[PDB]
Amino acid sequence: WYAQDQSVALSNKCFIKCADLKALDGQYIEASDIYSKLIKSSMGNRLSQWSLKDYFLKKGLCQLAATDAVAAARTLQEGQSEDPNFADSRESNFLKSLIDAVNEGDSEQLSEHCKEFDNFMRLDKWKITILNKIKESIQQQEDDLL
Amino acid sequence: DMTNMDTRTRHLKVSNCPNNSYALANVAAVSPNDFPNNIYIIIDNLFVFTTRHSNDIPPGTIGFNGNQRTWGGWSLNQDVQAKAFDLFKYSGKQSYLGSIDIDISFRARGKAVSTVFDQDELAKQFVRCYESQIFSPTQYLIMEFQGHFFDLKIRNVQAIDLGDIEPTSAVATGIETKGILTKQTQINFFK
Amino acid sequence: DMTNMDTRTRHLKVSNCPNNSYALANVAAVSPNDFPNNIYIIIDNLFVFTTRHSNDIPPGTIGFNGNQRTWGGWSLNQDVQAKAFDLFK
């Protein structure tokens, strides 16, 4: 409804809440779709830059919670090419590191990257849950390895 | 038997593999409606795979495992054009594998062991798992041996016809060369 | 009681363990039509295991865990020979 009223920021806040809850609720694909909508709505606005910087990251994280590492890489590439701020942002490097770790299936490397990311930028409970499910998915893959 | 079959192009969306068995079969999991069973199909005129029926994949979608998708450079929920692939009409005569080199790696780097494995056993089990399939260089696959999961990357393929006592074809590294796996193929394993 | 049991050889496929509990028990899970319950069976004349009835494994198949495969150096879907065993004799 806020979008129907052309109130971009209120719709963006509501969509942030919706995507956060959806990702926490097991609906990673829908949360990533809402994050894409947020990215598209916030593109070109100087006030929401950082939000974008996080958005991309979060989206990728959701795509990585869905075991869709290729989509996370696509999101990272899109963010790097579309938003210069995100390209040089620590969030972009962290997302790339997570994508590489999932590609090599090195859960410990993912944990090290998470600690490094926490050391400079504190993680929040949403990210904690997403990365915990991701690590448990690596463990499930290890179960499938047998 | 490609003497009688349609060759129309079909647009199928790449999805997750249904289960590890199909992935271990090196087959593209397609619905019975999408394609008959055990027939070669080429996607993007580059990637050849053997169709296998699966009830978990709805019509209009093509199933691939992780390594095959990585080789194809495809994202989840992406369209790909698949066509019926006639190796006999494509290569004409060089439809068999004279030599095939495979680089074997531990899928789990942490599960490496120092035991000495014999490459003949690897050849036997690889043929057993993937007999009568079209292979091209630079192809990633997953194979389970002695309880250990290995990633196999085809390094180079030499294509020969049935009747050449002396191999006259140069060992080719390009994806263009293709041949059906046979017990007579000279299989080499590298690190 | 191991006095009476069919000792005929059977060729059985190695498959993934049905679940972690069966792997923990370290008992060869077999169907009732395969062999009696709670008897010792030898495989390849080297690997001895205790049978337990399991309805999730169809007749003609034998379940193994990763460690047993490591001990025998076996791959999935490999064919192995199974017979009745009598350690006392």
Side-chain angles (χ1 to χ4, degrees):
Chain A
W1 308 322
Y2 281 138
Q4 288 172 13
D5 219 17
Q6 303 181 43
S7 198
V8 174
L10 296 170
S11 186
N12 168 295
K13 186 189 182 200
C14 297
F15 274 30
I16 289 162
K17 276 292 203 158
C18 182
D20 182 308
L21 284 177
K22 278 192 178 289
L24 278 159
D25 193 56
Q27 308 176 37
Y28 312 153
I29 305 302
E30 201 149 20
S32 167
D33 292 342
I34 297 172
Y35 281 121
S36 308
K37 291 176 187 172
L38 286 160
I39 284 158
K40 286 174 183 178
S41 74
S42 303
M43 163 215 68
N45 189 354
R46 313 160 74 264
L47 302 173
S48 323
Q49 171 43 255
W50 327 111
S51 312
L52 188 69
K53 292 228 266 174
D54 269 0
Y55 291 160
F56 282 113
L57 172 59
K58 289 205 177 178
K59 180 183 165 209
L61 288 169
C62 292
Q63 314 222 271
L64 181 82
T67 63
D68 196 346
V70 184
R74 156 160 54 160
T75 294
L76 171 70
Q77 287 175 2
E78 286 168 3
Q80 289 175 346
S81 75
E82 183 203 83
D83 175 32
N85 299 96
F86 175 76
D88 301 321
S89 73
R90 315 214 79 71
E91 295 87 330
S92 160
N93 317 87
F94 185 45
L95 180 59
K96 186 188 172 185
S97 293
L98 293 171
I99 292 157
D100 294 338
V102 76
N103 281 321
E104 318 326 311
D106 195 336
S107 67
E108 280 66 349
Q109 194 192 78
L110 184 146
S111 306
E112 301 147 48
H113 290 314
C114 164
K115 303 328 170 290
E116 288 180 334
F117 191 78
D118 179 53
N119 165 280
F120 294 107
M121 341 178 68
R122 295 152 273 278
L123 80 184
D124 48 77
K125 189 43 168 210
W126 180 98
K127 264 161 203 84
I128 289 171
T129 303
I130 310 322
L131 284 159
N132 292 350
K133 304 312 151 274
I134 292 161
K135 282 209 80 191
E136 271 146 30
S137 169
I138 306 315
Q139 295 319 103
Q140 293 147 23
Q141 286 313 101
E142 293 237 305
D143 306 334
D144 285 314
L145 281 180
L146 194 133
Chain B
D1 192 357
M2 281 286 248
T3 54
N4 293 317
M5 229 180 55
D6 187 21
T7 57
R8 282 172 186 184
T9 311
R10 300 191 186 204
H11 287 73
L12 306 176
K13 278 189 176 190
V14 183
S15 67
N16 274 319
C17 61
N19 59 54
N20 294 338
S21 82
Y22 284 77
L24 287 170
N26 194 40
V27 299
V30 300
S31 192
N33 300 336
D34 292 323
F35 276 105
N37 185 25
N38 200 51
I39 56 155
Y40 303 122
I41 51 162
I42 189 158
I43 315 186
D44 299 334
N45 304 326
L46 288 168
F47 314 91
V48 176
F49 295 104
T50 310
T51 62
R52 197 170 183 177
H53 290 185
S54 182
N55 294 343
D56 296 326
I57 298 176
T61 58
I62 188 160
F64 278 123
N65 59 24
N67 285 38
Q68 291 167 329
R69 286 199 313 235
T70 308
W71 183 39
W74 306 308
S75 297
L76 281 163
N77 312 329
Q78 185 170 351
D79 282 313
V80 297
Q81 293 186 20
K83 324 185 194 200
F85 182 70
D86 192 352
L87 184 69
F88 299 101
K89 283 183 187 169
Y90 179 78
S91 191
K93 284 190 176 185
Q94 292 187 141
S95 300
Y96 295 92
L97 299 177
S99 75
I100 183 166
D101 294 356
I102 311 178
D103 301 341
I104 179 161
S105 56
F106 275 99
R107 193 177 198 196
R109 295 187 182 181
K111 303 185 191 201
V113 194
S114 60
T115 55
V116 187
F117 309 91
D118 200 319
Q119 302 196 348
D120 294 334
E121 300 183 347
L122 293 169
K124 286 172 186 172
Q125 190 70 357
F126 188 89
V127 173
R128 181 182 172 189
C129 285
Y130 319 114
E131 194 170 355
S132 306
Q133 295 184 7
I134 292 171
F135 286 107
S136 54
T138 78
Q139 180 169 8
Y140 294 96
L141 192 50
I142 301 156
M143 180 187 186
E144 185 270 321
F145 183 70
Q146 300 180 356
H148 304 285
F149 269 65
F150 293 99
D151 284 326
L152 309 182
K153 182 194 179 167
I154 305 180
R155 186 166 181 173
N156 61 49
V157 169
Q158 196 184 47
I160 313 185
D161 194 2
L162 185 70
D164 285 329
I165 296 165
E166 294 183 348
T168 54
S169 296
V171 186
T173 55
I175 192 167
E176 301 296 341
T177 194
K178 289 165 185 68
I180 294 157
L181 189 72
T182 69
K183 302 188 188 182
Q184 297 180 350
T185 307
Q186 302 173 346
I187 300 153
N188 292 312
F189 292 100
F190 295 89
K191 296 194 179 199
Chain C
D1 196 356
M2 82 310 289
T3 51
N4 287 314
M5 81 185 98
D6 187 21
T7 64
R8 287 161 191 184
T9 310
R10 293 197 189 205
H11 283 83
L12 314 176
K13 273 188 176 190
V14 174
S15 69
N16 270 316
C17 52
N19 59 54
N20 291 337
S21 87
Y22 276 82
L24 290 168
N26 195 39
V27 295
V30 303
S31 186
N33 300 337
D34 290 325
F35 285 108
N37 192 32
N38 194 51
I39 57 155
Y40 314 124
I41 55 162
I42 193 151
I43 319 181
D44 305 332
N45 302 327
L46 282 168
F47 316 83
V48 177
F49 296 109
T50 311
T51 64
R52 191 177 178 178
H53 277 187
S54 185
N55 295 346
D56 296 323
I57 295 166
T61 56
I62 191 158
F64 285 123
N65 60 27
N67 282 36
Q68 289 162 338
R69 285 190 297 253
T70 306
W71 178 27
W74 301 309
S75 301
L76 283 162
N77 306 326
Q78 181 163 346
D79 290 312
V80 295
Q81 305 174 19
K83 316 188 195 199
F85 187 57
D86 195 355
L87 182 74
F88 304 98
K89 285 184 184 171

PDB file of all heavy atoms in Angstrom, chain A residues 100-124:
ATOM      1  N   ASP A 100      33.100 -18.120  -1.941  1.00  0.00           N
ATOM      2  CA  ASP A 100      34.242 -18.994  -2.174  1.00  0.00           C
ATOM      3  C   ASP A 100      34.262 -20.141  -1.172  1.00  0.00           C
ATOM      4  O   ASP A 100      34.495 -21.297  -1.544  1.00  0.00           O
ATOM      5  CB  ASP A 100      35.533 -18.181  -2.092  1.00  0.00           C
ATOM      6  CG  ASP A 100      35.652 -17.167  -3.213  1.00  0.00           C
ATOM      7  OD1 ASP A 100      34.997 -17.357  -4.260  1.00  0.00           O
ATOM      8  OD2 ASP A 100      36.393 -16.176  -3.046  1.00  0.00           O
ATOM      9  N   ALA A 101      33.988 -19.843   0.102  1.00  0.00           N
ATOM     10  CA  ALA A 101      34.000 -20.882   1.127  1.00  0.00           C
ATOM     11  C   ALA A 101      32.946 -21.946   0.850  1.00  0.00           C
ATOM     12  O   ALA A 101      33.216 -23.143   0.993  1.00  0.00           O
ATOM     13  CB  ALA A 101      33.789 -20.262   2.509  1.00  0.00           C
ATOM     14  N   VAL A 102      31.739 -21.536   0.459  1.00  0.00           N
ATOM     15  CA  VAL A 102      30.711 -22.527   0.145  1.00  0.00           C
ATOM     16  C   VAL A 102      31.113 -23.326  -1.089  1.00  0.00           C
ATOM     17  O   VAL A 102      30.828 -24.526  -1.187  1.00  0.00           O
ATOM     18  CB  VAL A 102      29.327 -21.863  -0.016  1.00  0.00           C
ATOM     19  CG1 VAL A 102      29.160 -21.115  -1.340  1.00  0.00           C
ATOM     20  CG2 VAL A 102      28.210 -22.876   0.148  1.00  0.00           C
ATOM     21  N   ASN A 103      31.763 -22.675  -2.055  1.00  0.00           N
ATOM     22  CA  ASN A 103      32.204 -23.392  -3.245  1.00  0.00           C
ATOM     23  C   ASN A 103      33.227 -24.468  -2.905  1.00  0.00           C
ATOM     24  O   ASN A 103      33.159 -25.584  -3.432  1.00  0.00           O
ATOM     25  CB  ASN A 103      32.780 -22.401  -4.250  1.00  0.00           C
ATOM     26  CG  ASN A 103      31.705 -21.676  -5.026  1.00  0.00           C
ATOM     27  OD1 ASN A 103      30.693 -22.263  -5.404  1.00  0.00           O
ATOM     28  ND2 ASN A 103      31.912 -20.387  -5.257  1.00  0.00           N
ATOM     29  N   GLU A 104      34.181 -24.159  -2.025  1.00  0.00           N
ATOM     30  CA  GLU A 104      35.159 -25.163  -1.617  1.00  0.00           C
ATOM     31  C   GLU A 104      34.656 -26.071  -0.502  1.00  0.00           C
ATOM     32  O   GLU A 104      35.345 -27.036  -0.156  1.00  0.00           O
ATOM     33  CB  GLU A 104      36.479 -24.516  -1.175  1.00  0.00           C
ATOM     34  CG  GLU A 104      36.986 -23.349  -2.024  1.00  0.00           C
ATOM     35  CD  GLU A 104      36.662 -23.491  -3.503  1.00  0.00           C
ATOM     36  OE1 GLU A 104      36.929 -24.572  -4.071  1.00  0.00           O
ATOM     37  OE2 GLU A 104      36.137 -22.523  -4.094  1.00  0.00           O
ATOM     38  N   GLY A 105      33.490 -25.790   0.069  1.00  0.00           N
ATOM     39  CA  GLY A 105      32.972 -26.612   1.150  1.00  0.00           C
ATOM     40  C   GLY A 105      33.837 -26.611   2.391  1.00  0.00           C
ATOM     41  O   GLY A 105      33.946 -27.640   3.069  1.00  0.00           O
ATOM     42  N   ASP A 106      34.460 -25.474   2.706  1.00  0.00           N
ATOM     43  CA  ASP A 106      35.323 -25.344   3.878  1.00  0.00           C
ATOM     44  C   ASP A 106      34.523 -24.548   4.906  1.00  0.00           C
ATOM     45  O   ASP A 106      34.517 -23.317   4.903  1.00  0.00           O
ATOM     46  CB  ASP A 106      36.635 -24.654   3.521  1.00  0.00           C
ATOM     47  CG  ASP A 106      37.689 -24.822   4.591  1.00  0.00           C
ATOM     48  OD1 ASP A 106      37.324 -25.058   5.760  1.00  0.00           O
ATOM     49  OD2 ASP A 106      38.888 -24.705   4.266  1.00  0.00           O
ATOM     50  N   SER A 107      33.845 -25.269   5.801  1.00  0.00           N
ATOM     51  CA  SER A 107      33.058 -24.619   6.845  1.00  0.00           C
ATOM     52  C   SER A 107      33.943 -23.807   7.788  1.00  0.00           C
ATOM     53  O   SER A 107      33.569 -22.702   8.199  1.00  0.00           O
ATOM     54  CB  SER A 107      32.235 -25.664   7.600  1.00  0.00           C
ATOM     55  OG  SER A 107      33.060 -26.538   8.340  1.00  0.00           O
ATOM     56  N   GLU A 108      35.127 -24.323   8.128  1.00  0.00           N
ATOM     57  CA  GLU A 108      36.025 -23.586   9.017  1.00  0.00           C
ATOM     58  C   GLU A 108      36.467 -22.276   8.385  1.00  0.00           C
ATOM     59  O   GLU A 108      36.594 -21.257   9.074  1.00  0.00           O
ATOM     60  CB  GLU A 108      37.274 -24.403   9.388  1.00  0.00           C
ATOM     61  CG  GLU A 108      37.191 -25.492  10.486  1.00  0.00           C
ATOM     62  CD  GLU A 108      36.327 -26.710  10.181  1.00  0.00           C
ATOM     63  OE1 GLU A 108      35.567 -26.721   9.197  1.00  0.00           O
ATOM     64  OE2 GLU A 108      36.419 -27.682  10.961  1.00  0.00           O
ATOM     65  N   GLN A 109      36.720 -22.280   7.080  1.00  0.00           N
ATOM     66  CA  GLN A 109      37.081 -21.037   6.410  1.00  0.00           C
ATOM     67  C   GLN A 109      35.939 -20.034   6.490  1.00  0.00           C
ATOM     68  O   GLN A 109      36.165 -18.834   6.686  1.00  0.00           O
ATOM     69  CB  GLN A 109      37.453 -21.318   4.957  1.00  0.00           C
ATOM     70  CG  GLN A 109      38.157 -20.162   4.287  1.00  0.00           C
ATOM     71  CD  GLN A 109      38.253 -20.323   2.786  1.00  0.00           C
ATOM     72  OE1 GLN A 109      37.280 -20.099   2.063  1.00  0.00           O
ATOM     73  NE2 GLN A 109      39.425 -20.725   2.306  1.00  0.00           N
ATOM     74  N   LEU A 110      34.702 -20.512   6.343  1.00  0.00           N
ATOM     75  CA  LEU A 110      33.548 -19.634   6.501  1.00  0.00           C
ATOM     76  C   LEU A 110      33.494 -19.053   7.906  1.00  0.00           C
ATOM     77  O   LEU A 110      33.197 -17.867   8.083  1.00  0.00           O
ATOM     78  CB  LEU A 110      32.264 -20.408   6.198  1.00  0.00           C
ATOM     79  CG  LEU A 110      30.940 -19.640   6.222  1.00  0.00           C
ATOM     80  CD1 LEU A 110      29.994 -20.197   5.177  1.00  0.00           C
ATOM     81  CD2 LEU A 110      30.289 -19.697   7.600  1.00  0.00           C
ATOM     82  N   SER A 111      33.768 -19.876   8.918  1.00  0.00           N
ATOM     83  CA  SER A 111      33.778 -19.369  10.285  1.00  0.00           C
ATOM     84  C   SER A 111      34.855 -18.311  10.473  1.00  0.00           C
ATOM     85  O   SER A 111      34.617 -17.279  11.111  1.00  0.00           O
ATOM     86  CB  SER A 111      33.978 -20.521  11.267  1.00  0.00           C
ATOM     87  OG  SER A 111      33.024 -21.539  11.060  1.00  0.00           O
ATOM     88  N   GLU A 112      36.042 -18.543   9.915  1.00  0.00           N
ATOM     89  CA  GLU A 112      37.111 -17.554  10.026  1.00  0.00           C
ATOM     90  C   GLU A 112      36.707 -16.246   9.368  1.00  0.00           C
ATOM     91  O   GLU A 112      36.950 -15.161   9.911  1.00  0.00           O
ATOM     92  CB  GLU A 112      38.397 -18.082   9.395  1.00  0.00           C
ATOM     93  CG  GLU A 112      38.916 -19.365  10.008  1.00  0.00           C
ATOM     94  CD  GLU A 112      39.615 -20.242   8.993  1.00  0.00           C
ATOM     95  OE1 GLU A 112      40.466 -19.719   8.245  1.00  0.00           O
ATOM     96  OE2 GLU A 112      39.306 -21.452   8.937  1.00  0.00           O
ATOM     97  N   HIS A 113      36.086 -16.330   8.194  1.00  0.00           N
ATOM     98  CA  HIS A 113      35.632 -15.122   7.520  1.00  0.00           C
ATOM     99  C   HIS A 113      34.577 -14.405   8.346  1.00  0.00           C
ATOM    100  O   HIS A 113      34.567 -13.171   8.420  1.00  0.00           O
ATOM    101  CB  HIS A 113      35.083 -15.476   6.143  1.00  0.00           C
ATOM    102  CG  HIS A 113      36.136 -15.898   5.169  1.00  0.00           C
ATOM    103  ND1 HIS A 113      37.315 -15.205   5.006  1.00  0.00           N
ATOM    104  CD2 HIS A 113      36.195 -16.949   4.318  1.00  0.00           C
ATOM    105  CE1 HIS A 113      38.053 -15.805   4.091  1.00  0.00           C
ATOM    106  NE2 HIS A 113      37.396 -16.864   3.655  1.00  0.00           N
ATOM    107  N   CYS A 114      33.670 -15.160   8.963  1.00  0.00           N
ATOM    108  CA  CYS A 114      32.661 -14.544   9.817  1.00  0.00           C
ATOM    109  C   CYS A 114      33.299 -13.821  10.996  1.00  0.00           C
ATOM    110  O   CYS A 114      32.880 -12.715  11.350  1.00  0.00           O
ATOM    111  CB  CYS A 114      31.674 -15.602  10.307  1.00  0.00           C
ATOM    112  SG  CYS A 114      30.667 -15.060  11.704  1.00  0.00           S
ATOM    113  N   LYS A 115      34.299 -14.434  11.632  1.00  0.00           N
ATOM    114  CA  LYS A 115      34.970 -13.762  12.745  1.00  0.00           C
ATOM    115  C   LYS A 115      35.692 -12.509  12.274  1.00  0.00           C
ATOM    116  O   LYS A 115      35.659 -11.472  12.951  1.00  0.00           O
ATOM    117  CB  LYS A 115      35.939 -14.715  13.450  1.00  0.00           C
ATOM    118  CG  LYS A 115      35.336 -16.019  13.992  1.00  0.00           C
ATOM    119  CD  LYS A 115      33.879 -15.903  14.460  1.00  0.00           C
ATOM    120  CE  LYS A 115      33.291 -17.264  14.743  1.00  0.00           C
ATOM    121  NZ  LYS A 115      33.088 -18.017  13.478  1.00  0.00           N
ATOM    122  N   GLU A 116      36.350 -12.581  11.118  1.00  0.00           N
ATOM    123  CA  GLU A 116      37.025 -11.401  10.587  1.00  0.00           C
ATOM    124  C   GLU A 116      36.023 -10.294  10.316  1.00  0.00           C
ATOM    125  O   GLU A 116      36.275  -9.123  10.621  1.00  0.00           O
ATOM    126  CB  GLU A 116      37.788 -11.757   9.313  1.00  0.00           C
ATOM    127  CG  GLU A 116      39.027 -12.601   9.547  1.00  0.00           C
ATOM    128  CD  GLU A 116      39.758 -12.921   8.260  1.00  0.00           C
ATOM    129  OE1 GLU A 116      39.103 -12.937   7.196  1.00  0.00           O
ATOM    130  OE2 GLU A 116      40.985 -13.155   8.309  1.00  0.00           O
ATOM    131  N   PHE A 117      34.877 -10.649   9.741  1.00  0.00           N
ATOM    132  CA  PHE A 117      33.848  -9.655   9.475  1.00  0.00           C
ATOM    133  C   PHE A 117      33.306  -9.067  10.763  1.00  0.00           C
ATOM    134  O   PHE A 117      33.005  -7.877  10.823  1.00  0.00           O
ATOM    135  CB  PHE A 117      32.714 -10.260   8.659  1.00  0.00           C
ATOM    136  CG  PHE A 117      31.757  -9.241   8.140  1.00  0.00           C
ATOM    137  CD1 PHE A 117      32.079  -8.472   7.043  1.00  0.00           C
ATOM    138  CD2 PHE A 117      30.535  -9.047   8.752  1.00  0.00           C
ATOM    139  CE1 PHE A 117      31.205  -7.530   6.554  1.00  0.00           C
ATOM    140  CE2 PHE A 117      29.648  -8.105   8.276  1.00  0.00           C
ATOM    141  CZ  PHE A 117      29.984  -7.339   7.173  1.00  0.00           C
ATOM    142  N   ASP A 118      33.108  -9.899  11.780  1.00  0.00           N
ATOM    143  CA  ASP A 118      32.628  -9.400  13.064  1.00  0.00           C
ATOM    144  C   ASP A 118      33.621  -8.441  13.706  1.00  0.00           C
ATOM    145  O   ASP A 118      33.224  -7.446  14.322  1.00  0.00           O
ATOM    146  CB  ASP A 118      32.354 -10.568  14.003  1.00  0.00           C
ATOM    147  CG  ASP A 118      31.868 -10.110  15.359  1.00  0.00           C
ATOM    148  OD1 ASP A 118      30.886  -9.342  15.412  1.00  0.00           O
ATOM    149  OD2 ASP A 118      32.477 -10.509  16.372  1.00  0.00           O
ATOM    150  N   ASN A 119      34.917  -8.728  13.573  1.00  0.00           N
ATOM    151  CA  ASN A 119      35.939  -7.909  14.219  1.00  0.00           C
ATOM    152  C   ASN A 119      35.888  -6.440  13.810  1.00  0.00           C
ATOM    153  O   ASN A 119      36.220  -5.569  14.622  1.00  0.00           O
ATOM    154  CB  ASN A 119      37.318  -8.484  13.906  1.00  0.00           C
ATOM    155  CG  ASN A 119      38.438  -7.514  14.217  1.00  0.00           C
ATOM    156  OD1 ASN A 119      38.730  -6.606  13.437  1.00  0.00           O
ATOM    157  ND2 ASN A 119      39.066  -7.694  15.370  1.00  0.00           N
ATOM    158  N   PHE A 120      35.476  -6.137  12.583  1.00  0.00           N
ATOM    159  CA  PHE A 120      35.418  -4.760  12.094  1.00  0.00           C
ATOM    160  C   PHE A 120      34.004  -4.202  12.037  1.00  0.00           C
ATOM    161  O   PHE A 120      33.794  -3.015  12.295  1.00  0.00           O
ATOM    162  CB  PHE A 120      36.051  -4.684  10.704  1.00  0.00           C
ATOM    163  CG  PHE A 120      37.526  -4.959  10.699  1.00  0.00           C
ATOM    164  CD1 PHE A 120      38.019  -6.152  10.207  1.00  0.00           C
ATOM    165  CD2 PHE A 120      38.416  -4.036  11.217  1.00  0.00           C
ATOM    166  CE1 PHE A 120      39.373  -6.416  10.208  1.00  0.00           C
ATOM    167  CE2 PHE A 120      39.776  -4.285  11.223  1.00  0.00           C
ATOM    168  CZ  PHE A 120      40.258  -5.482  10.724  1.00  0.00           C
ATOM    169  N   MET A 121      33.039  -5.048  11.702  1.00  0.00           N
ATOM    170  CA  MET A 121      31.625  -4.695  11.629  1.00  0.00           C
ATOM    171  C   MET A 121      30.834  -5.774  12.354  1.00  0.00           C
ATOM    172  O   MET A 121      30.760  -6.915  11.889  1.00  0.00           O
ATOM    173  CB  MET A 121      31.169  -4.576  10.173  1.00  0.00           C
ATOM    174  CG  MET A 121      32.295  -4.382   9.163  1.00  0.00           C
ATOM    175  SD  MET A 121      31.694  -4.313   7.467  1.00  0.00           S
ATOM    176  CE  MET A 121      30.781  -2.775   7.456  1.00  0.00           C
ATOM    177  N   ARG A 122      30.249  -5.405  13.491  1.00  0.00           N
ATOM    178  CA  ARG A 122      29.526  -6.357  14.327  1.00  0.00           C
ATOM    179  C   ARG A 122      28.369  -6.990  13.573  1.00  0.00           C
ATOM    180  O   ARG A 122      27.615  -6.306  12.875  1.00  0.00           O
ATOM    181  CB  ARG A 122      29.008  -5.665  15.583  1.00  0.00           C
ATOM    182  CG  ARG A 122      30.105  -5.180  16.493  1.00  0.00           C
ATOM    183  CD  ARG A 122      29.662  -3.985  17.298  1.00  0.00           C
ATOM    184  NE  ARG A 122      29.896  -2.754  16.557  1.00  0.00           N
ATOM    185  CZ  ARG A 122      31.059  -2.115  16.497  1.00  0.00           C
ATOM    186  NH1 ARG A 122      32.135  -2.573  17.120  1.00  0.00           N
ATOM    187  NH2 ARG A 122      31.148  -0.998  15.785  1.00  0.00           N
ATOM    188  N   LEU A 123      28.238  -8.303  13.707  1.00  0.00           N
ATOM    189  CA  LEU A 123      27.129  -8.995  13.078  1.00  0.00           C
ATOM    190  C   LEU A 123      25.882  -8.886  13.954  1.00  0.00           C
ATOM    191  O   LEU A 123      25.955  -8.642  15.162  1.00  0.00           O
ATOM    192  CB  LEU A 123      27.474 -10.467  12.824  1.00  0.00           C
ATOM    193  CG  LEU A 123      27.388 -11.474  13.980  1.00  0.00           C
ATOM    194  CD1 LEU A 123      27.868 -12.838  13.511  1.00  0.00           C
ATOM    195  CD2 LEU A 123      28.191 -11.074  15.192  1.00  0.00           C
ATOM    196  N   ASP A 124      24.729  -9.054  13.323  1.00  0.00           N
ATOM    197  CA  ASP A 124      23.431  -8.997  13.980  1.00  0.00           C
ATOM    198  C   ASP A 124      22.817 -10.391  13.990  1.00  0.00           C
ATOM    199  O   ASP A 124      23.284 -11.292  13.299  1.00  0.00           O
ATOM    200  CB  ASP A 124      22.512  -7.980  13.288  1.00  0.00           C
ATOM    201  CG  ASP A 124      22.493  -8.133  11.784  1.00  0.00           C
ATOM    202  OD1 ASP A 124      21.833  -9.064  11.290  1.00  0.00           O
ATOM    203  OD2 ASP A 124      23.132  -7.313  11.093  1.00  0.00           O
TER     204      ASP A 124
END
